[PDB]
Amino acid sequence: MPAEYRYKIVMLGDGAVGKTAMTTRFTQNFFDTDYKRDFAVKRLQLDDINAHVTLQIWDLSVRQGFYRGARGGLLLYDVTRRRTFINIENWKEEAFRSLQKEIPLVVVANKVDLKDSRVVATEEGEEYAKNNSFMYVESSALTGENVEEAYANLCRIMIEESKDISEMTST
Ligand SMILES: Nc1nc2c(ncn2[C@@H]2O[C@H](COP(=O)(O)OP(=O)(O)O)[C@@H](O)[C@H]2O)c(=O)[nH]1
């Protein structure tokens, strides 16, 4: 039998960066320009470590309830709009201030299928993530590229932090 984990996570980023589309791709495995949209649920098996994760995936007084109890998040920007890349630091700070602690974040450069209108280079997002010891993923909700991987990476990080805490409480 697999180990069982449960986490609330938050989708962060400016409007129209693809938070809903990424969540829809992850939980329903499709994409629709005309998808009409507080949380979605995903049950995910991680074979490598025989672990089963149940995720509550939250997506935008209200902000404090939005963040409360989150153990991780995806920090999205739209690679075709530099202003959304500039603002990921503001989202990180808002989340950390609301929670009064750091939580693991995976930096997600979304919409990479839009090659001809991309303005934020891969190396810029890698550098921001590296400065914060965040992982970095290039994703497309449209094609599905690396969408599951982004959530899976975050899941594994939260599981390792759960294990860390188990050890700290067991000295
Ligand atoms: N080409 C492309 N379009 C995307 C992608 N992700 C989202 N979109 C589109 O970008 C727009 C904004 O996405 P949405 O999910 O509403 O962003 P949200 O406001 O952050 O939840 C919608 O028209 C989506 O269909 C993507 O990965 N590639």
Side-chain angles (χ1 to χ4, degrees):
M1 294 304 254
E4 297 289 346
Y5 300 89
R6 303 168 177 156
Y7 303 108
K8 159 167 172 176
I9 65 171
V10 287
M11 304 292 292
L12 310 178
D14 283 1
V17 301
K19 297 181 302 295
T20 303
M22 188 166 191
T23 303
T24 300
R25 167 62 69 184
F26 184 52
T27 63
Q28 301 182 60
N29 218 349
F30 80 105
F31 178 87
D32 194 337
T33 305
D34 309 307
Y35 183 84
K36 298 314 154 209
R37 67 267 287 240
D38 289 319
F39 60 95
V41 173
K42 172 90 187 221
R43 291 162 193 85
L44 186 67
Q45 168 70 20
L46 307 174
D47 185 359
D48 358 78
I49 48 163
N50 193 25
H52 188 240
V53 183
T54 300
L55 289 181
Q56 277 180 14
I57 303 169
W58 284 60
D59 191 353
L60 270 333
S61 284
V62 60
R63 76 156 50 73
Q64 200 89 4
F66 167 75
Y67 290 109
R68 189 163 313 121
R71 283 279 313 260
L74 300 182
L75 181 54
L76 271 66
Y77 60 99
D78 179 345
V79 303
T80 70
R81 296 185 291 129
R82 173 161 300 275
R83 178 55 49 155
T84 71
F85 177 64
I86 298 182
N87 282 342
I88 63 180
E89 173 67 17
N90 293 318
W91 283 101
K92 181 198 79 177
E93 296 175 353
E94 184 178 274
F96 290 180
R97 194 179 320 242
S98 179
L99 296 162
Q100 285 298 292
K101 63 171 181 175
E102 302 167 42
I103 58 170
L105 299 177
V106 177
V107 177
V108 176
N110 193 41
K111 304 198 193 179
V112 301
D113 60 287
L114 296 175
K115 294 105 57 195
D116 300 314
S117 50
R118 176 168 193 167
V119 309
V120 186
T122 292
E123 297 69 27
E124 307 185 67
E126 285 169 346
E127 183 192 39
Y128 176 87
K130 175 180 178 179
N131 294 339
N132 286 274
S133 199
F134 296 154
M135 302 300 102
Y136 173 78
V137 174
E138 300 219 340
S139 73
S140 169
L142 191 156
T143 69
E145 182 191 330
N146 294 330
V147 169
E148 191 271 353
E149 180 221 319
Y151 288 93
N153 293 343
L154 180 63
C155 285
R156 183 54 184 277
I157 294 166
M158 296 183 299
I159 288 171
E160 293 306 311
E161 311 213 331
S162 286
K163 293 175 178 178
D164 296 333
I165 296 162
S166 292
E167 290 136 14
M168 293 177 197
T169 62
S170 298
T171 60

Short mmCIF file of all heavy atoms in Angstrom, two decimals, residues 11-24 31-35 37 59-60 76 78 80-81 109-114 139-145 147, ligand 1:
data_model
loop_
_atom_site.label_atom_id
_atom_site.label_comp_id
_atom_site.label_asym_id
_atom_site.label_seq_id
_atom_site.Cartn_x
_atom_site.Cartn_y
_atom_site.Cartn_z
N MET A 11 -2.44 28.47 -6.76
CA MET A 11 -1.97 28.95 -8.05
C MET A 11 -1.80 30.46 -7.96
O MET A 11 -2.74 31.17 -7.61
CB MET A 11 -2.96 28.59 -9.16
CG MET A 11 -3.28 27.12 -9.26
SD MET A 11 -1.85 26.16 -9.82
CE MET A 11 -1.66 26.73 -11.52
N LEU A 12 -0.60 30.95 -8.26
CA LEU A 12 -0.27 32.36 -8.13
C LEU A 12 0.13 32.92 -9.49
O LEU A 12 0.65 32.21 -10.35
CB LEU A 12 0.87 32.57 -7.12
CG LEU A 12 0.69 31.88 -5.77
CD1 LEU A 12 1.89 32.13 -4.88
CD2 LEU A 12 -0.58 32.36 -5.08
N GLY A 13 -0.13 34.20 -9.68
CA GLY A 13 0.27 34.89 -10.90
C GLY A 13 -0.79 35.87 -11.37
O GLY A 13 -1.96 35.82 -10.97
N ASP A 14 -0.37 36.77 -12.26
CA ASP A 14 -1.24 37.83 -12.75
C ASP A 14 -2.43 37.25 -13.51
O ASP A 14 -2.48 36.07 -13.85
CB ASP A 14 -0.46 38.78 -13.66
CG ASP A 14 0.43 39.74 -12.90
OD1 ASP A 14 0.47 39.67 -11.66
OD2 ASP A 14 1.08 40.57 -13.56
N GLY A 15 -3.40 38.12 -13.79
CA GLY A 15 -4.54 37.70 -14.58
C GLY A 15 -4.11 37.23 -15.96
O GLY A 15 -3.20 37.79 -16.57
N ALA A 16 -4.75 36.16 -16.44
CA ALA A 16 -4.58 35.62 -17.78
C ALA A 16 -3.19 35.02 -18.03
O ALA A 16 -2.78 34.87 -19.19
CB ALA A 16 -4.89 36.68 -18.85
N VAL A 17 -2.45 34.66 -16.97
CA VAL A 17 -1.20 33.94 -17.19
C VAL A 17 -1.45 32.45 -17.43
O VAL A 17 -0.56 31.76 -17.94
CB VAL A 17 -0.22 34.11 -16.02
CG1 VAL A 17 0.12 35.60 -15.81
CG2 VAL A 17 -0.76 33.47 -14.74
N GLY A 18 -2.63 31.95 -17.07
CA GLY A 18 -2.98 30.57 -17.36
C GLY A 18 -3.21 29.71 -16.13
O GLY A 18 -3.11 28.48 -16.22
N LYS A 19 -3.50 30.33 -14.99
CA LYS A 19 -3.73 29.57 -13.77
C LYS A 19 -4.89 28.59 -13.93
O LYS A 19 -4.76 27.40 -13.60
CB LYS A 19 -4.00 30.53 -12.60
CG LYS A 19 -2.82 31.45 -12.26
CD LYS A 19 -3.16 32.34 -11.08
CE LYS A 19 -4.39 33.20 -11.34
NZ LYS A 19 -4.18 34.20 -12.43
N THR A 20 -6.03 29.06 -14.44
CA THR A 20 -7.16 28.16 -14.65
C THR A 20 -6.84 27.10 -15.69
O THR A 20 -7.08 25.90 -15.47
CB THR A 20 -8.39 28.97 -15.06
OG1 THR A 20 -8.67 29.96 -14.07
CG2 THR A 20 -9.60 28.06 -15.19
N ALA A 21 -6.29 27.51 -16.83
CA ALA A 21 -5.99 26.57 -17.90
C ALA A 21 -5.01 25.49 -17.43
O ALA A 21 -5.14 24.32 -17.81
CB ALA A 21 -5.44 27.31 -19.11
N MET A 22 -4.02 25.87 -16.63
CA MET A 22 -3.09 24.88 -16.11
C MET A 22 -3.80 23.90 -15.18
O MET A 22 -3.55 22.69 -15.23
CB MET A 22 -1.92 25.56 -15.41
CG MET A 22 -0.82 24.61 -15.02
SD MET A 22 0.70 25.45 -14.55
CE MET A 22 1.83 24.06 -14.50
N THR A 23 -4.68 24.42 -14.32
CA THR A 23 -5.40 23.54 -13.40
C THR A 23 -6.35 22.63 -14.16
O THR A 23 -6.47 21.44 -13.84
CB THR A 23 -6.16 24.38 -12.36
OG1 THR A 23 -5.23 25.22 -11.66
CG2 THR A 23 -6.87 23.47 -11.36
N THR A 24 -7.03 23.17 -15.17
CA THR A 24 -7.91 22.35 -16.00
C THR A 24 -7.12 21.27 -16.73
O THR A 24 -7.55 20.11 -16.79
CB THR A 24 -8.66 23.24 -16.99
OG1 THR A 24 -9.44 24.20 -16.27
CG2 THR A 24 -9.58 22.40 -17.88
N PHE A 31 -7.90 21.25 -22.86
CA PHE A 31 -7.73 22.69 -23.02
C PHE A 31 -8.84 23.22 -23.90
O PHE A 31 -9.21 22.59 -24.90
CB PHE A 31 -6.36 23.00 -23.64
CG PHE A 31 -6.10 24.46 -23.88
CD1 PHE A 31 -5.56 25.25 -22.89
CD2 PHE A 31 -6.36 25.03 -25.12
CE1 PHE A 31 -5.30 26.59 -23.11
CE2 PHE A 31 -6.10 26.37 -25.35
CZ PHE A 31 -5.57 27.15 -24.35
N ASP A 32 -9.39 24.38 -23.54
CA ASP A 32 -10.49 24.98 -24.30
C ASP A 32 -10.41 26.49 -24.12
O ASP A 32 -10.47 26.97 -22.98
CB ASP A 32 -11.85 24.45 -23.81
CG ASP A 32 -13.00 24.78 -24.77
OD1 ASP A 32 -12.89 25.76 -25.55
OD2 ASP A 32 -14.02 24.07 -24.73
N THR A 33 -10.27 27.22 -25.23
CA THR A 33 -10.28 28.68 -25.17
C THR A 33 -11.55 29.20 -24.52
O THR A 33 -11.55 30.28 -23.92
CB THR A 33 -10.12 29.26 -26.58
OG1 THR A 33 -8.95 28.72 -27.19
CG2 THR A 33 -10.01 30.78 -26.55
N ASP A 34 -12.64 28.45 -24.64
CA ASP A 34 -13.94 28.87 -24.14
C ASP A 34 -14.33 28.15 -22.85
O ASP A 34 -15.52 28.07 -22.53
CB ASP A 34 -14.99 28.64 -25.22
CG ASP A 34 -14.57 29.25 -26.53
OD1 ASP A 34 -14.24 30.45 -26.53
OD2 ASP A 34 -14.53 28.52 -27.55
N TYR A 35 -13.35 27.63 -22.12
CA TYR A 35 -13.63 27.09 -20.80
C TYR A 35 -14.19 28.19 -19.91
O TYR A 35 -13.60 29.26 -19.78
CB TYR A 35 -12.37 26.50 -20.18
CG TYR A 35 -12.63 25.85 -18.84
CD1 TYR A 35 -13.09 24.55 -18.75
CD2 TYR A 35 -12.43 26.55 -17.65
CE1 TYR A 35 -13.33 23.95 -17.53
CE2 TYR A 35 -12.67 25.96 -16.42
CZ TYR A 35 -13.12 24.66 -16.37
OH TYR A 35 -13.36 24.07 -15.15
N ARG A 37 -14.99 29.13 -16.14
CA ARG A 37 -14.66 28.76 -14.76
C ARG A 37 -15.80 29.14 -13.84
O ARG A 37 -16.73 29.85 -14.24
CB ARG A 37 -13.36 29.43 -14.31
CG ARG A 37 -13.45 30.95 -14.19
CD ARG A 37 -13.00 31.64 -15.47
NE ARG A 37 -11.55 31.57 -15.67
CZ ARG A 37 -10.75 32.62 -15.77
NH1 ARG A 37 -11.25 33.85 -15.70
NH2 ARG A 37 -9.45 32.45 -15.95
N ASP A 59 -7.33 28.75 -6.48
CA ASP A 59 -7.12 29.71 -7.55
C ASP A 59 -8.03 30.91 -7.32
O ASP A 59 -9.24 30.75 -7.18
CB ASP A 59 -7.42 29.06 -8.91
CG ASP A 59 -6.97 29.91 -10.09
OD1 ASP A 59 -6.54 31.07 -9.87
OD2 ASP A 59 -7.04 29.41 -11.23
N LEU A 60 -7.44 32.11 -7.27
CA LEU A 60 -8.23 33.34 -7.16
C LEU A 60 -9.23 33.44 -8.30
O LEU A 60 -8.84 33.60 -9.46
CB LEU A 60 -7.33 34.59 -7.17
CG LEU A 60 -6.75 35.22 -5.89
CD1 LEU A 60 -7.62 34.96 -4.66
CD2 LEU A 60 -5.31 34.79 -5.66
N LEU A 76 3.16 31.34 -11.46
CA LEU A 76 3.06 31.40 -12.92
C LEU A 76 3.34 32.79 -13.45
O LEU A 76 3.00 33.80 -12.82
CB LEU A 76 1.66 30.96 -13.38
CG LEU A 76 1.38 29.49 -13.65
CD1 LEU A 76 1.48 28.68 -12.38
CD2 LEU A 76 -0.01 29.36 -14.29
N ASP A 78 3.34 34.65 -17.72
CA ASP A 78 3.07 34.47 -19.14
C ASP A 78 4.31 34.92 -19.89
O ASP A 78 4.67 36.10 -19.86
CB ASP A 78 1.84 35.31 -19.52
CG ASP A 78 1.47 35.23 -21.00
OD1 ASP A 78 2.28 34.77 -21.82
OD2 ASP A 78 0.34 35.64 -21.34
N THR A 80 4.85 35.64 -22.76
CA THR A 80 4.60 36.64 -23.79
C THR A 80 4.34 38.03 -23.22
O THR A 80 4.18 38.97 -24.01
CB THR A 80 3.40 36.22 -24.65
OG1 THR A 80 2.19 36.32 -23.88
CG2 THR A 80 3.57 34.80 -25.16
N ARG A 81 4.30 38.19 -21.90
CA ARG A 81 4.01 39.48 -21.28
C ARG A 81 4.98 39.70 -20.13
O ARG A 81 4.83 39.09 -19.06
CB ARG A 81 2.56 39.55 -20.80
CG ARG A 81 1.55 39.48 -21.94
CD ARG A 81 0.11 39.67 -21.48
NE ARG A 81 -0.37 38.54 -20.68
CZ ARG A 81 -0.95 38.68 -19.49
NH1 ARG A 81 -1.14 39.89 -18.98
NH2 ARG A 81 -1.35 37.61 -18.82
N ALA A 109 6.97 29.06 -16.13
CA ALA A 109 6.90 29.93 -17.30
C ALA A 109 5.89 29.32 -18.26
O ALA A 109 6.18 28.34 -18.94
CB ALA A 109 8.28 30.08 -17.93
N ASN A 110 4.68 29.88 -18.30
CA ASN A 110 3.58 29.29 -19.05
C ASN A 110 3.44 29.92 -20.43
O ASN A 110 3.94 31.02 -20.69
CB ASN A 110 2.26 29.43 -18.28
CG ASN A 110 1.15 28.56 -18.86
OD1 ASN A 110 1.39 27.41 -19.25
ND2 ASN A 110 -0.05 29.11 -18.95
N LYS A 111 2.73 29.21 -21.32
CA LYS A 111 2.44 29.62 -22.70
C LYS A 111 3.67 29.54 -23.60
O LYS A 111 3.78 30.30 -24.57
CB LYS A 111 1.85 31.03 -22.76
CG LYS A 111 0.58 31.23 -21.93
CD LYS A 111 -0.16 32.48 -22.41
CE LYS A 111 -1.25 32.89 -21.42
NZ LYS A 111 -1.95 34.14 -21.88
N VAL A 112 4.60 28.63 -23.31
CA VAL A 112 5.81 28.52 -24.13
C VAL A 112 5.52 28.00 -25.53
O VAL A 112 6.40 28.05 -26.39
CB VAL A 112 6.86 27.64 -23.43
CG1 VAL A 112 7.24 28.22 -22.07
CG2 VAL A 112 6.36 26.21 -23.29
N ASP A 113 4.30 27.52 -25.79
CA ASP A 113 3.93 27.16 -27.15
C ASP A 113 3.85 28.38 -28.06
O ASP A 113 3.87 28.22 -29.29
CB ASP A 113 2.60 26.42 -27.16
CG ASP A 113 1.46 27.25 -26.59
OD1 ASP A 113 1.42 27.44 -25.36
OD2 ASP A 113 0.62 27.73 -27.38
N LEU A 114 3.73 29.58 -27.49
CA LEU A 114 3.62 30.81 -28.27
C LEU A 114 5.02 31.36 -28.60
O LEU A 114 5.43 32.42 -28.12
CB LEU A 114 2.79 31.84 -27.52
CG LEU A 114 1.31 31.50 -27.27
CD1 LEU A 114 0.65 32.56 -26.40
CD2 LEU A 114 0.56 31.36 -28.58
N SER A 139 6.11 25.43 -19.26
CA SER A 139 4.87 24.68 -19.41
C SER A 139 3.98 25.30 -20.48
O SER A 139 4.11 26.48 -20.83
CB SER A 139 4.10 24.60 -18.09
OG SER A 139 3.50 25.85 -17.80
N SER A 140 3.05 24.48 -20.97
CA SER A 140 1.98 24.96 -21.84
C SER A 140 0.71 24.21 -21.46
O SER A 140 0.64 22.99 -21.63
CB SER A 140 2.30 24.76 -23.31
OG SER A 140 1.14 24.99 -24.10
N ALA A 141 -0.28 24.92 -20.94
CA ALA A 141 -1.58 24.30 -20.71
C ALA A 141 -2.20 23.83 -22.02
O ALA A 141 -2.91 22.81 -22.03
CB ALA A 141 -2.51 25.27 -19.99
N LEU A 142 -1.93 24.52 -23.12
CA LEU A 142 -2.51 24.15 -24.41
C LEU A 142 -2.01 22.78 -24.86
O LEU A 142 -2.80 21.89 -25.17
CB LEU A 142 -2.21 25.22 -25.45
CG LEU A 142 -2.94 25.16 -26.80
CD1 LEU A 142 -2.99 26.54 -27.45
CD2 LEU A 142 -2.29 24.15 -27.76
N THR A 143 -0.69 22.61 -24.94
CA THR A 143 -0.15 21.35 -25.41
C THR A 143 -0.02 20.31 -24.31
O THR A 143 0.14 19.12 -24.61
CB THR A 143 1.23 21.56 -26.04
OG1 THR A 143 2.17 21.90 -25.02
CG2 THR A 143 1.19 22.66 -27.11
N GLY A 144 -0.10 20.74 -23.05
CA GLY A 144 0.14 19.86 -21.92
C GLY A 144 1.58 19.76 -21.50
O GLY A 144 1.88 19.08 -20.52
N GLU A 145 2.49 20.44 -22.21
CA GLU A 145 3.92 20.29 -21.97
C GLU A 145 4.27 20.63 -20.52
O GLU A 145 4.02 21.74 -20.06
CB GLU A 145 4.70 21.20 -22.92
CG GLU A 145 6.21 21.09 -22.78
CD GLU A 145 6.96 22.18 -23.55
OE1 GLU A 145 6.44 22.65 -24.58
OE2 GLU A 145 8.06 22.56 -23.10
N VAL A 147 3.05 20.13 -17.71
CA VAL A 147 2.08 20.57 -16.72
C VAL A 147 2.03 19.61 -15.54
O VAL A 147 2.15 20.02 -14.38
CB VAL A 147 0.69 20.75 -17.37
CG1 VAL A 147 -0.38 20.95 -16.27
CG2 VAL A 147 0.72 21.93 -18.33
N1 LIG B 1 -1.37 29.43 -26.30
C1 LIG B 1 -1.62 29.25 -25.00
N2 LIG B 1 -2.69 29.88 -24.39
C2 LIG B 1 -2.92 29.69 -23.07
C3 LIG B 1 -2.11 28.86 -22.30
N3 LIG B 1 -2.58 28.87 -21.04
C4 LIG B 1 -3.67 29.68 -20.99
N4 LIG B 1 -3.89 30.18 -22.25
C5 LIG B 1 -4.95 31.12 -22.66
O1 LIG B 1 -4.69 32.35 -22.02
C6 LIG B 1 -5.89 32.96 -21.56
C7 LIG B 1 -5.84 33.11 -20.05
O2 LIG B 1 -5.83 31.85 -19.40
P1 LIG B 1 -6.58 31.64 -17.99
O3 LIG B 1 -6.59 30.20 -17.64
O4 LIG B 1 -7.92 32.27 -18.02
O5 LIG B 1 -5.59 32.47 -17.04
P2 LIG B 1 -5.86 32.84 -15.49
O6 LIG B 1 -6.58 34.27 -15.56
O7 LIG B 1 -4.51 33.01 -14.89
O8 LIG B 1 -6.67 31.83 -14.80
C8 LIG B 1 -7.01 32.05 -22.00
O9 LIG B 1 -7.46 32.51 -23.25
C9 LIG B 1 -6.34 30.71 -22.20
O10 LIG B 1 -7.02 29.92 -23.15
C10 LIG B 1 -1.04 28.23 -22.91
O11 LIG B 1 -0.29 27.49 -22.26
N5 LIG B 1 -0.80 28.43 -24.25
#
